[PDB]
Design a protein around this nucleic acid. Structure first.
Ligand SMILES: *C(=O)[C@H](CCSC)NC=O
Ligand SMILES: [Mg+2]
Ligand SMILES: [Mg+2]
Ligand SMILES: [Mg+2]
Ligand SMILES: [Mg+2]
Ligand SMILES: [Mg+2]
Ligand SMILES: [Mg+2]
Ligand SMILES: [Mg+2]
Ligand SMILES: [Mg+2]
Ligand SMILES: [Mg+2]
Ligand SMILES: [Mg+2]
Ligand SMILES: [Mg+2]
Ligand SMILES: [Mg+2]
Ligand SMILES: [Mg+2]
Ligand SMILES: [Mg+2]
Ligand SMILES: [Mg+2]
Ligand SMILES: [Mg+2]
Ligand SMILES: [Mg+2]
Ligand SMILES: [Mg+2]
Ligand SMILES: [Mg+2]
Ligand SMILES: [Mg+2]
Ligand SMILES: [Mg+2]
Ligand SMILES: [Mg+2]
Ligand SMILES: [Mg+2]
Ligand SMILES: [Mg+2]
Ligand SMILES: [Mg+2]
Ligand SMILES: [Mg+2]
Ligand SMILES: [Mg+2]
Ligand SMILES: [Mg+2]
Ligand SMILES: [Mg+2]
Ligand SMILES: [Mg+2]
Ligand SMILES: [Mg+2]
Ligand SMILES: [Mg+2]
Ligand SMILES: [Mg+2]
Ligand SMILES: [Mg+2]
Ligand SMILES: [Mg+2]
Ligand SMILES: [Mg+2]
Ligand SMILES: [Zn+2]
Lengths: 175, 134, 168, 224, 118, 38, 137
RNA sequence: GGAGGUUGGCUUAGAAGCAGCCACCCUUUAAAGAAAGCGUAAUAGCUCACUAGUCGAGUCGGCCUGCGCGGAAGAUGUAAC
RNA sequence: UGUCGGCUCAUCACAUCCUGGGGCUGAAGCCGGUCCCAAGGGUAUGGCUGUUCGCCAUUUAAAGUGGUACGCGAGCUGGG
């Protein structure tokens, strides 16, 4: 249980609340993150944060390290931020953010308009780059995956929306 | 940029083309390199050239050692290497011929002594389909 | 004006267009870039020893970007009027009619050849552009006069056929 | 005449070197000389190593009686690109079964010539097995000399299929099955595990232990 | 890879035989400019040629067991740039100072001109 | 996706995973190495 | 395939297959062996199939022994034949296998090459097998 | 960090590690493949392999064995306690 | 306990022929091959022959494979 044993090492400006099995983290530049704990973890509080198990079961050992990682994401998510870079490849492919609506042109008859949910915000520095700014990983990653699923990449020419940290296989037509 | 000029391109610019793949600059100003450098080894040696765009258009020519492909082709036989190396000899080479260009190519080669320096060209001539003998 | 087909089965025909043109207009689409047939066309033009003026077409499309064409054509040794300056480039829109007047200005500006025709009073001399057989009036030959003047009722010798012109 | 003779000499030398080729002969008419030369040049790279296409008669203008009965004398296909046949050529085409196609784009002609070329090759005569029988005991019949009383060991045996008799793994006879019997029944098929009587008129050389093999040939053809 | 059968033993024996060289030794930590600058410092092999080498810090303590340059045990932490001279004590300290003048890497750990704790 | 009674690794980058009661092979390099069941 | 050159009698009773193989359970010639751990019988087509699948994998030296011989003839009644009317004719030859019998042996190869090659042979046999090494006692 | 001969030779408008074929050496090193992948029209430019540093105590695999998991598709209606 | 085929009328299974959803491809596109999920609805007319079947002609998105006393004569027929 290497992950569970490791303390969280929270930064300077972070407010911690602990109502037993209910936890909430307050941070500057984005706040209001909270989650509930399963009944088999003890969170001792100090200048740091550390996680321990209650039972000696297999599932308790596995879930002790999951609760540590979830809290670490919350702590970073309020102090720092989470962003996931996307880029478009192809001809005529362009994106444009107009408030809370992100319009994409991905080679269909109609242009797709995607409604960014509350919380995260997207911004387009250029016509072929999308940023998904947010404070939690699950909502940022889920939205970036929904947008990417409109026109996923092709092997023969590589066209389509792709993760900026993604490797795309390529092939050629025979002969 | 690491283009390889060929004995002069002041007037002609078929292979010079210092505008495609790099920020296009003055061609008339840059093409005068063939005059100041004046090649050095006949009007046949293709020499390496390195230029910098600098701030806006400030040209700067460095000129490196001649490539070790024309010396191994235009000085010891046919100027074209064999299609299949190490399978059909292109032309015999003596140890003195390699040592003739070894001192001229004093740039880099990371050689502490001339004993090791010859071994660098030996692997180069083998890849060309030539035959090297001591 | 001579209009030639663009497919690869008509290369000989394209050659026949090169030996009579005195100027080549190379049309290349801005989106599609340089393709095999435009390379073959510039090969024909070089073999003919003739000046080349291009017209980067379909510029009205949002894609456009008539810049990679410059590099591609420079690779085949067709220097733009900029850079060094051998042949003039010009963007046109064909079906919007933007830049067509400038293209015409560029092509008629090629008076550096001086286009001297010798006398128009010489005996006619020309080349056959095409030929066909008509069921009502026999062999019909579409010929481009090169110099001299061709008049009705004149003895003509073309290829191995000869004869005199009933009609023109 | 000189070019025709030189081409004949070269073609005869090459053909005698290789073997023979299957030709597809066409009579081609067009409206303009440029179209005719383009078609002739483009219909030369369509052949293969075993089939080829030949233009036996060209020309410019409508389809006439002369080229109609020139195609009649060469089993040729009569192609007219942007031209029409007159009344007499139409009479001739109706009288016999000559096939005449009209066109206005050269690529339709190319596609049709390719489709016609693809219909002149029918190999892949490899065999696939159906059953094997093993001979044990010998009988005689008035019409068929030697009757092999045998047992089918694998697969199936059908009354009229090509056969292959082999003893000690070497073939001796490659005819077909003529008489198949179950006692006195004249059955058409026997499955493995069943005993039967085999009779072939030309086999005539039967001995216990000889293997009899039954197969079929399926033609998957080739392509260009 | 780097096994303990002979990769640790051979490097220790070679370094021990190299510990009997000139007393002065130069140590630094090159986590900066590319190998070209490292090969630039290797150009001294033609002119000066003191040691131009860097070895594992773990095996550095095991080596130099002859009590000739024992002061380097307490200074070889993290990266090391052991550059023990052969003759003319100095040189390595002076050359690297000029090398560090024209660059931004190189930390210079200590020296070994006779018994001297940095 | 290849469905067989006997699934197993086909190269160095294959992984054996159990997902909701089914043994699967997922490859990060070659998409033909995907397998199900077994 | 494998079968006796001649036999005293053409047919045999089915019999029973009981007991363990106390005789033929040692590595007597080679260094490694394939040993049967379940009882069944090999039909002289599985023996030849497993031999070719075994010698092919080695293809460079090595000596190979076969310790099983099919000497029991079995009959089969043809299709569409009633019960009785005499015993059927001999179709193939089989060998009785009891648990603990050594089937194949090999020497002159590495342990890993023999272990790979006996795996290929065991996939052609209708019974459980195992890999063993030669010991003094 | 991930380099120099070096755009290896041929081919190609142009093939510069990375269209295709042949070969696949040397050099200073701790380490770097005539290169496994992405990208360039060809360059350029982000990776990997490999090596050095930090970390700080376990890690890898086989054998025997109890109970379980897939392999497991049918006809009037659950319908194989 | 009336045995083939035809007519009329059906009902179920899924080991799916079409339509629907997917993975791989030696998948450029248009078409394909193979495997997984899926039983809601659909799923020819004739010439020959007593034929089921089969072979032909011309269609269709497709002309599925099987169980039901090889479904169905106290529902018809009677060519075998
Ligand atoms: C003929 O009677 C045949 C012989 C089998 S082998 C003696 N049996 C059945 O048709
Ligand atoms: Mg197009
Ligand atoms: Mg699920
Ligand atoms: Mg019995
Ligand atoms: Mg006994
Ligand atoms: Mg177990
Ligand atoms: Mg089970
Ligand atoms: Mg059931
Ligand atoms: Mg049911
Ligand atoms: Mg009744
Ligand atoms: Mg009905
Ligand atoms: Mg039911
Ligand atoms: Mg199903
Ligand atoms: Mg199936
Ligand atoms: Mg289906
Ligand atoms: Mg379907
Ligand atoms: Mg599919
Ligand atoms: Mg259905
Ligand atoms: Mg249905
Ligand atoms: Mg239903
Ligand atoms: Mg249902
Ligand atoms: Mg419904
Ligand atoms: Mg009908
Ligand atoms: Mg019918
Ligand atoms: Mg009838
Ligand atoms: Mg039914
Ligand atoms: Mg039933
Ligand atoms: Mg039935
Ligand atoms: Mg019935
Ligand atoms: Mg039925
Ligand atoms: Mg009735
Ligand atoms: Mg009835
Ligand atoms: Mg009645
Ligand atoms: Mg009744
Ligand atoms: Mg009644
Ligand atoms: Mg009757
Ligand atoms: Mg009657
Ligand atoms: Zn894999």
């Amino acid at each position: 249980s290497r992950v569970a044993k490791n303390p969280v090492k929270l930064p300077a400006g972070v407010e911690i609340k602990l109502a037993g099995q209910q936890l909430s983290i307050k941070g500057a530049k984005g706040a209001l993150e909270l989650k509930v704990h399963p009944s088999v973890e003890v969170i001792q509080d100090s200048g740091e944060l550390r996680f321990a198990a209650r039972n000696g079961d297999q599932q308790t050992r596995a879930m002790a390290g999951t609760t540590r990682a979830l809290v670490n994401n919350m702590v970073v998510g309020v102090s720092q931020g989470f962003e996931r870079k996307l880029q478009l490849v192809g001809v005529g492919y362009k994106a444009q953010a107009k408030g809370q609506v992100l319009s994409l042109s991905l080679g269909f008859s109609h242009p797709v308009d995607y409604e960014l949910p509350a919380g995260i915000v997207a911004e387009t520095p250029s016509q072929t780059d999308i940023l998904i700014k947010g404070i939690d990983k699950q909502l940022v990653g889920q939205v970036a995956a929904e947008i990417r699923d409109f026109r996923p990449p092709e092997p023969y020419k590589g066209k389509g929306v792709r993760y900026a940290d993604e490797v795309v296989r390529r092939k050629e037509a025979k002969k | 940029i690491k283009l390889q000029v060929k004995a002069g391109q002041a007037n002609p610019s078929p292979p010079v083309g210092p505008a495609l793949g790099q920020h296009g600059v003055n061609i008339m100003e840059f093409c005068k390199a063939f005059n100041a450098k004046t090649q050095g080894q006949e009007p046949g040696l293709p020499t390496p050239v390195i230029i910098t765009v600098y701030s806006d258009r400030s040209f700067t020519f460095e000129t490196k050692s001649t490539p070790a492909a024309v010396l191994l082709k235009k000085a010891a036989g046919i100027t074209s290497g064999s299609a299949r190396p190490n399978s059909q000899k292109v032309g015999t080479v003596t140890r003195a011929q390699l040592e003739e260009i070894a001192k001229t190519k004093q740039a880099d080669l990371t050689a502490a002594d001339l004993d090791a320096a010859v071994r660098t060209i030996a692997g180069s001539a083998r890849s060309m389909g030539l035959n090297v003998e001591g | 004006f001579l209009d030639t087909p663009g497919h690869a089965a008509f290369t000989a025909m394209r050659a026949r267009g090169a030996q009579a043109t005195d100027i080549v207009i190379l049309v290349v689409a801005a989106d599609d870039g340089v393709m095999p047939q435009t390379q073959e066309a510039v090969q024909h033009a070089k073999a003919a020893g003739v000046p080349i003026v291009v017209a980067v077409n379909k510029i009205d499309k949002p894609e456009a970007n008539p810049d990679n064409i410059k590099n591609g054509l420079a690779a085949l040794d067709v220097i733009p009027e900029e850079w060094g300056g051998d042949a003039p480039f010009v963007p046109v829109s064909a079906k919007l009619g933007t830049g067509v007047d400038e293209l015409l200005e560029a092509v008629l500006l090629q008076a550096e050849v001086l286009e001297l025709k010798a006398t128009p009073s010489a005996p006619g001399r020309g080349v056959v552009v095409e030929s066909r057989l008509d069921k009502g009036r026999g062999p019909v030959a579409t010929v481009l006069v090169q110099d001299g003047t061709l008049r009705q009722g004149d003895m003509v010798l073309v290829g191995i056929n000869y004869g005199r012109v009933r009609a023109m | 005449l000189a070019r025709a003779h030189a081409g004949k000499l070269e073609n005869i030398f090459e053909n005698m070197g290789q073997e023979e080729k299957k030709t597809l002969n066409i009579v081609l008419k067009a409206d303009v000389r440029g179209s005719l030369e383009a078609l002739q040049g483009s219909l030369s790279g369509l052949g293969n190593d075993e089939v080829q296409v030949r233009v036996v008669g060209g020309g410019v203008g409508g389809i006439t009686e002369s080229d109609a009965n020139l195609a009649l004398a060469s089993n040729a296909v009569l192609f007219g690109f942007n031209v029409r046949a007159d009344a007499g050529a139409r009479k001739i085409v109706e009288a016999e079964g000559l096939d005449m196609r009209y066109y206005n784009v050269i690529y339709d002609i190319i596609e049709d010539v390719k489709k016609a070329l693809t219909g002149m090759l029918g190999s892949d005569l490899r065999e696939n097995i159906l059953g094997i029988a093993e001979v044990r005991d010998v009988f005689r019949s008035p019409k068929f000399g030697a009757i092999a009383g045998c047992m089918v060991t694998e697969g199936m045996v059908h009354r009229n299929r090509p056969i292959r008799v082999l003893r000690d793994d070497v073939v001796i006879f490659e005819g077909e099955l003529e008489s198949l019997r179950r006692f006195k029944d004249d059955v058409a098929e026997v499955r493995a595990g069943m005993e039967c009587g085999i009779g072939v008129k030309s086999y005539n050389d039967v001995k216990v232990g000889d293997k009899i093999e039954v197969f079929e040939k399926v033609e998957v053809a080739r392509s260009l | 890879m780097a096994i303990k059968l002979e990769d640790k033993k051979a490097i220790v024996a070679e370094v021990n035989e190299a510990a009997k060289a000139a007393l002065s030794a130069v140590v630094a930590d090159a986590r900066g400019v590319t190998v070209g600058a490292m090969t630039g410092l290797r150009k001294e092999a033609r002119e000066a040629g003191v040691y131009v080498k860097v070895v594992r810090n773990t095996l550095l303590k095991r080596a130099v067991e002859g009590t000739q340059f024992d002061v380097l045990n307490d200074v070889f932490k993290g990266p090391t740039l052991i550059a023990f001279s052969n003759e003319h004590p100095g040189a390595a300290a002076r050359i690297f100072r000029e090398f560090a003048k024209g660059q931004d890497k190189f930390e210079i750990k200590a020296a070994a001109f006779e018994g001297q704790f940095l | 996706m290849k469905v067989r009674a006997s699934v197993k690794k086909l190269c160095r980058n294959c992984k054996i995973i159990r997902r909701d009661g089914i043994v699967r092979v997922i490859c990060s390099a070659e998409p033909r190495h995907k397998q199900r069941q077994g | 395939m494998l079968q006796p050159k001649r036999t005293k009698f053409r047919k045999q009773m089915t019999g029973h297959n009981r007991g363990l193989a106390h005789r033929g359970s040692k590595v007597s010639f080679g260094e490694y062996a394939l040993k049967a751990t379940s009882r069944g019988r090999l039909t002289a087509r599985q023996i030849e199939s497993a031999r070719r699948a075994l010698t092919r994998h080695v293809k460079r030296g090595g000596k190979i022994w076969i310790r099983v011989f099919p000497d029991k003839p079995v009959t089969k009644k043809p299709l569409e034949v009633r019960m009785g009317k005499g015993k059927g004719g001999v179709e193939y030859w089989v060998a009785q296998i009891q648990p603990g019998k050594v089937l194949y042996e090999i020497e002159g190869v590495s342990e890993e090459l023999a272990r790979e090659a006996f795996a290929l042979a065991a996939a052609k046999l209708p019974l459980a097998t195992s890999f063993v090494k030669r010991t003094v006692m």
